[PDB]
Design an enzyme around this catalytic site. Structure first.
Site, short mmCIF file in Angstrom:
data_model
loop_
_atom_site.label_atom_id
_atom_site.label_comp_id
_atom_site.label_asym_id
_atom_site.label_seq_id
_atom_site.Cartn_x
_atom_site.Cartn_y
_atom_site.Cartn_z
N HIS A 158 5.79 6.85 6.73
CA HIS A 158 5.61 6.48 5.37
C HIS A 158 4.79 7.69 4.73
O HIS A 158 4.81 8.58 5.12
CB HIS A 158 4.55 5.41 5.10
CG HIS A 158 3.09 5.67 6.07
ND1 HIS A 158 3.04 5.46 7.29
CD2 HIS A 158 1.91 6.04 5.68
CE1 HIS A 158 1.67 6.06 7.46
NE2 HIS A 158 1.11 6.45 6.48
N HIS A 204 1.97 8.96 1.26
CA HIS A 204 0.82 8.79 0.44
C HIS A 204 1.01 9.69 -0.53
O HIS A 204 1.31 10.84 -0.48
CB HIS A 204 -0.48 9.18 1.31
CG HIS A 204 -0.81 8.43 2.58
ND1 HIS A 204 -1.71 7.21 2.53
CD2 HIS A 204 -0.39 8.58 3.82
CE1 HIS A 204 -1.60 6.93 3.84
NE2 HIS A 204 -0.78 7.47 4.50
N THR A 256 -5.81 6.25 8.55
CA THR A 256 -6.42 6.51 7.57
C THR A 256 -6.51 5.23 6.51
O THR A 256 -7.13 5.46 5.44
CB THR A 256 -5.70 7.63 6.58
OG1 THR A 256 -4.43 7.29 6.34
CG2 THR A 256 -5.83 9.02 7.54
N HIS A 310 3.69 10.69 6.76
CA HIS A 310 2.78 10.36 8.16
C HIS A 310 4.10 9.77 9.11
O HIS A 310 4.79 8.80 8.73
CB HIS A 310 1.95 9.59 7.97
CG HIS A 310 0.63 10.11 7.24
ND1 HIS A 310 -0.23 9.41 6.75
CD2 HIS A 310 0.46 11.55 7.37
CE1 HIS A 310 -1.33 10.37 6.40
NE2 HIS A 310 -0.91 11.60 6.49
N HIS A 358 0.88 -1.18 -0.02
CA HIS A 358 0.09 0.00 0.10
C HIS A 358 1.09 1.29 0.04
O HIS A 358 0.30 2.19 -0.54
CB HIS A 358 -0.95 0.14 1.00
CG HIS A 358 -1.71 -1.38 1.15
ND1 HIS A 358 -2.74 -1.63 0.35
CD2 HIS A 358 -1.49 -2.31 2.36
CE1 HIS A 358 -3.22 -2.69 0.66
NE2 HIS A 358 -2.71 -3.15 1.84
N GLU A 393 -3.68 13.37 1.79
CA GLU A 393 -4.84 12.68 2.54
C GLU A 393 -5.66 14.00 2.99
O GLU A 393 -6.93 14.31 2.76
CB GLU A 393 -4.31 11.78 3.57
CG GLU A 393 -3.68 10.77 2.97
CD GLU A 393 -4.06 9.31 3.81
OE1 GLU A 393 -3.58 9.05 4.91
OE2 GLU A 393 -4.61 8.32 3.30
C1 LIG Z 1 -2.88 0.67 9.51
C2 LIG Z 1 -1.75 1.03 10.16
N1 LIG Z 1 -1.34 0.60 11.34
C3 LIG Z 1 -0.08 1.34 11.62
C4 LIG Z 1 -0.02 2.20 10.53
N2 LIG Z 1 1.10 3.03 10.07
O1 LIG Z 1 1.98 3.05 11.36
O2 LIG Z 1 1.43 3.48 9.32
N3 LIG Z 1 -0.92 2.15 9.64
C5 LIG Z 1 -1.10 2.45 8.38
C6 LIG Z 1 -2.04 3.63 8.28
O3 LIG Z 1 -1.23 4.97 9.09
S1 LIG Z 1 -1.94 6.12 8.89
N4 LIG Z 1 -2.11 6.69 7.33
O4 LIG Z 1 -3.19 6.36 9.70
O5 LIG Z 1 -0.71 7.04 9.49
ZN LIG Z 2 -0.32 7.41 6.35
#
Ligand SMILES: Cc1ncc([N+](=O)[O-])n1CCOS(N)(=O)=O
Ligand SMILES: [Zn+2]
EC number: 4.2.1.1
Length: 256
Positions: free
Chosen positions: A91, A93, A195, A116, A61, A103
């Site tokens: 990470h 987006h 998200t 993020h 993703h 986002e």
């Molecule tokens: C589903 C999930 N668990 C931990 C993480 N993470 O640390 O990125 N995510 C991805 C989505 O994270 S986010 N976009 O809300 O910052």
């Molecule tokens: Zn994110």
């Protein structure tokens, strides 16, 4: 099963994750004229001098740069937060075009991407327990616009060739996340959620007002990544962003 395609994208997530239509979902549009300055908010404290990165992973993703969070080495505190939150990973987006990818939006404006930096509340012992709490996570969001290159991001751009497809990972030590921060730490903050599925409502969002600039070449490399695994038809990893959700009963506060 979920993804960002026409058949498994954001509009479909609510079937497997009903909380998608919850009361504090993210992201949201940040209406700058309606956000209220909160003089009581404390300055944000980002202490990343001892951050220890370990690896970078393409999870199908996005790509995640993971950190060793077994000790208090990279922490976020202050701002709207009570306590200390430890960095676990960051990470991005991004979009298929420079005109979209973020986002959160600012007065409906979409940025080319959004970073993020995910942190979990140390009072909960670990990330898995923290996500089950309303104040379990603090995610620092930073917008990216295309212009001049971000020197501090290049090491990330250069390693992407090695994790092109889902499931691939690579050693990624000594990366300094301070190189991804803008000059100003002014921010907007509101209570929200992860998200992506499971969309848990455990996040205090802290979104910086100042975007960082990255070059067209840098974001172009992000767009060469794949959502698919090796040996599967290639589907470029682009537009892995969830659109803005209803603000509902929430106020976005500004630190400035
Ligand atoms: C589903 C999930 N668990 C931990 C993480 N993470 O640390 O990125 N995510 C991805 C989505 O994270 S986010 N976009 O809300 O910052
Ligand atoms: Zn994110």
């Amino acid at each position: 099963h979920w993804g960002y395609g026409k058949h498994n994208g954001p509009e479909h997530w609510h079937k497997d994750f009903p909380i998608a239509k919850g009361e504090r979902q993210s992201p949201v549009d940040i209406d700058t004229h309606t956000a209220k300055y909160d003089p009581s908010l404390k300055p944000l404290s980002v202490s990343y001098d001892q951050a220890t990165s370990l690896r970078i992973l393409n999870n199908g993703h996005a790509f995640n740069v993971e950190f060793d969070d077994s000790q208090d080495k990279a922490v976020l505190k202050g701002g709207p937060l009570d306590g200390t939150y430890r960095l676990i990973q960051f990470h991005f987006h991004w979009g298929s075009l420079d005109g979209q990818g973020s986002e959160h939006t600012v007065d409906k404006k979409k940025y080319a991407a959004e970073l993020h930096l995910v942190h979990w509340n140390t009072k909960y012992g670990d990330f898995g327990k923290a996500v089950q709490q309303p104040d379990g996570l603090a995610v620092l969001g930073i917008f990216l616009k295309v212009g001049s290159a971000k020197p501090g991001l290049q090491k990330v751009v250069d390693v992407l060739d090695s994790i092109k497809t889902k499931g691939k990972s690579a050693d990624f030590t000594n990366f300094d996340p301070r190189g991804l921060l803008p000059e100003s730490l002014d921010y907007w903050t509101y209570p929200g959620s992860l998200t992506t599925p499971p969309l848990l409502e455990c996040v205090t969002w802290i979104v910086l007002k100042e975007p960082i600039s990255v070059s067209s070449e840098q974001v172009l490399k992000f767009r060469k990544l794949n959502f698919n695994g090796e040996g599967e038809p290639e589907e470029l990893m682009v537009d892995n962003w969830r659109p803005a959700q209803p603000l509902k009963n929430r106020q976005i506060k500004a630190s400035f």
